[PDB]
């Protein structure tokens, strides 16, 4: 294939299909109804996400978009893979501390909001108009980890003290792991255009996997995902 | 800009971000899971509507459709706001009387078909046939106000007397409310093409921001979104 | 119209209007909550059929796809019209068994993957990626066989005898009905092209009539739709 940053795009369709294989096979047998939750929405993440590097690989999951009078690759196809997963991680980190059906509902509908108008920006053809699609995108991202660190910390106090402590590290990821996404938008080929593409996507194919894998791994082995039952 | 009708959509622009920050502020430190809820669901109808009026003021939301021998601009954006915050002024009005899911399900599935057909009929590019997509949308959206009508009405007069009343004038309301969208439509530049597409623009967005900021205004200051508590 | 498959949109396009409307009526003054949740579901999934054959009837839902050195003609309106109603048939099936939430939440996202991968591969203009998208969504149809014949099979025993005996036969219908449509497929002009498209045409409106009517004529004749009272 005649796209330099082919390379990542295979790598990253090989571990989601690992991930997904995996986590398949890990989930066999469980039949705590609570269990099963987690593992449904765990799975699915990276089942997703191979599809989606899998059209990217082929070439499917790309399209051109002129701008500063050139013809950018975008793909499109990484907004359309976490349309799907974010609001999945965020229902394991609601499902855990049991957030109020109001506060889901916030979640959710911030995060369509963050992935609808970073998509805009990412097909804008005015340039300068692409970085006000950025600054929405980004006041929705600091709404929802906002609610996950001052919203849903005090719930979690009060419960299980392991669903507390499994909260906890899944947060610090989560609050690490998403900013990181802006900042990657903003310095690449989509944004400023300081880094190219081929780092761009190798930069983007590691956060995905350590959120869409690693960050199941981690979930998926704590006791906190089961019912307290003797 | 050189589109006579960018006033209007700059206008609706901001009164959406002022109606969606106002909103935001009314509903911090509120704890009451029920008032949560109606706080979560009617401040995400503005903020929709804030990033898709944007979409239309700066010309991202627009495309050209030809029929009747002409190329006519379609502010495809207004449909794509409608596709969500319309279930959501639903979703609304059903938590208030505590309607069943059964009920809830065909709402949201006919408001889904009304505004699916909506817009393919206004993508149609055979003149004739958009009609035909606006006859079945205008169905859809009467067997809507026909439930919240007869539907909805009876379980409403058995609740609290605040539900009972706050529901009846939202219901006022919606019906004229709604009502009036399909007939703009078949008036202006979709349609017949009697009003010209600056006053389309302008009915719409009195219309937008009725439901969207006015709608919610009511119900937020009503005593019916709280739990009856001491 | 100068395609010779009219003939078998209009027959479907008439069938699901015939069906949507039967059972509109049949569903009033339905008071039951259960059934009232089975009615809108089923009455549902024609009333988005008729929306969708009517719009492959008049032009609207069909694209020119390059692939084989050739302009394909391709029915994408089949697929959105499946992307909403398969999801609709297994709520159908779960609320029978009374499923647990994990296990829908699989069900529906592995249902998404299906015709997700295989809108990809109908559109995929590389001939031989085609049936690589081909193989996944049908690895993704096994997986939900799989499910409802060995994981809801076993919650149904344990249930009402009326409950037990109906998912039955709407499971052995459901198996091999959803299996007849990737054969179509592979053997139709989206896949090996050796039954050419108005051939095609027929055998996927004999299915989706059988699904998205006879599926419902059976499931509504059933007393399993009903609570147990007196
Ligand atoms: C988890 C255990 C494994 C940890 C692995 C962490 C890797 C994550 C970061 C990679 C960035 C790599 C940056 C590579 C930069 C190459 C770009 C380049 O060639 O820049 C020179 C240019 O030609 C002229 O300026
Ligand atoms: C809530 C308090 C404020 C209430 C405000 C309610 C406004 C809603 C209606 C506006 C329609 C305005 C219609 C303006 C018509 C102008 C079109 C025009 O110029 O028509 C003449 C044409 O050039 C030759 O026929
Ligand atoms: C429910 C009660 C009614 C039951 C009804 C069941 C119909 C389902 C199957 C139809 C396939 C029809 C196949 C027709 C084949 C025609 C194609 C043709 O013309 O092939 C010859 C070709 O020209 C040179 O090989
Ligand atoms: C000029 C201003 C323009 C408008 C601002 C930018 C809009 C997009 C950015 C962020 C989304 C904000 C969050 C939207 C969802 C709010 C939900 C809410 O208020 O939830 C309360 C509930 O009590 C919780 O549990
Ligand atoms: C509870 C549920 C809450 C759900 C909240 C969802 C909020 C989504 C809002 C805005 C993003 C809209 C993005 C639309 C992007 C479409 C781009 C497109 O397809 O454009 C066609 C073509 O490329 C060019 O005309
Ligand atoms: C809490 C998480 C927050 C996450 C969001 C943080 C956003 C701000 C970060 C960096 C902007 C720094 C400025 C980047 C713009 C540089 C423009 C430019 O011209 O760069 C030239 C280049 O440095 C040489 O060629
Ligand atoms: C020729 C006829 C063509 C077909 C007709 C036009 C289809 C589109 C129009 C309206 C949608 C109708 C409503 C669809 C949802 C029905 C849900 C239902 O029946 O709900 C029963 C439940 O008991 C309630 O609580
Ligand atoms: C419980 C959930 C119930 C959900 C019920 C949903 C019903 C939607 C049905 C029909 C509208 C379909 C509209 C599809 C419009 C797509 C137009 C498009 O993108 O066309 C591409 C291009 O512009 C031209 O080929
Ligand atoms: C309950 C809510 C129902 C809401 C839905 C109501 C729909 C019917 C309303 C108006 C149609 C009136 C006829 C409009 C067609 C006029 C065509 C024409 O040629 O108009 C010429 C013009 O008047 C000079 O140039
Ligand atoms: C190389 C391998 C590539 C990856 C494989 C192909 C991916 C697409 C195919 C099938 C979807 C599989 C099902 C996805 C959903 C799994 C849900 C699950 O595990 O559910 C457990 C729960 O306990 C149940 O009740
Ligand atoms: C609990 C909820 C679970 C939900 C699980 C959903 C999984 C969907 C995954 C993959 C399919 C993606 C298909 C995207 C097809 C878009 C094609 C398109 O519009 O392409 C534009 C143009 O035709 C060419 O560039
Ligand atoms: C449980 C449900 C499973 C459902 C899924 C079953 C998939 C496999 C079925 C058939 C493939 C048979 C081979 C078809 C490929 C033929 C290619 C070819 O060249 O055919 C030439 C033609 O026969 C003369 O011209
Ligand atoms: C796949 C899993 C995760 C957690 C992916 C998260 C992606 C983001 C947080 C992306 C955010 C963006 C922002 C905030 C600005 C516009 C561009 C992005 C969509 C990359
Ligand atoms: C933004 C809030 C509301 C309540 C918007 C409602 C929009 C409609 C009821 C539109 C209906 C249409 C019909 C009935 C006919 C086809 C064209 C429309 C989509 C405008
Ligand atoms: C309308 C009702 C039903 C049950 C329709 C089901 C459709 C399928 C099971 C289609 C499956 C496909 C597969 C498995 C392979 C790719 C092509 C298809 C989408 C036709």
Redesign the interface.
């Known amino acids: 294939t005649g796209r330099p940053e082919w390379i990542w795009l295979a790598l990253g369709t090989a571990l989601m299909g690992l991930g997904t294989l995996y986590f398949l096979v890990k989930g066999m047998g469980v039949s705590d ?1 609570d269990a ?6 765990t ?2 993440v990276p ?2 996400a191979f ?1 989606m590097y ?2 990217m690989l ?3 999951g790309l399209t051109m978009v002129p701008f500063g009078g050139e013809q950018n690759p975008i793909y499109w196809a990484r907004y359309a893979d976490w349309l ?1 997963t974010t609001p999945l991680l965020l229902l394991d980190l609601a499902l855990l501390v049991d957030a ?4 889901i ?2 979640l959710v ?2 995060d ?2 963050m992935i ?2 970073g998509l ?1 920006g990412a ?2 053809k ?1 340039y300068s ?1 692409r970085f ?1 699609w950025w600054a ?1 995108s980004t006041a929705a991202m600091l709404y929802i980890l906002y609610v996950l660190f001052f919203g849903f910390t005090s719930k979690a106090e009060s419960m299980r003290p392991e669903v507390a402590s499994t909260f906890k590290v899944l947060r610090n990821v989560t609050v690490v792991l998403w900013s990181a996404y802006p900042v990657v938008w903003l310095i690449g080929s989509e944004g400023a255009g300081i880094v190219p593409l081929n780092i761009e996507t190798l930069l983007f194919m590691v956060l995905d996997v350590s959120a869409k894998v690693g960050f199941g791994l981690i979930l998926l082995r704590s006791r906190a995902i089961f019912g307290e039952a003797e």
């Open positions: 109804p099963k939750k987690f593992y449904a929405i799975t699915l089942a997703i599809t899998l059209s082929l070439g499917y799907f109020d059906q109001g506060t509902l916030a509908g911030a369509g909001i609808g108008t805009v097909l804008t005015v108009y006000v929405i």
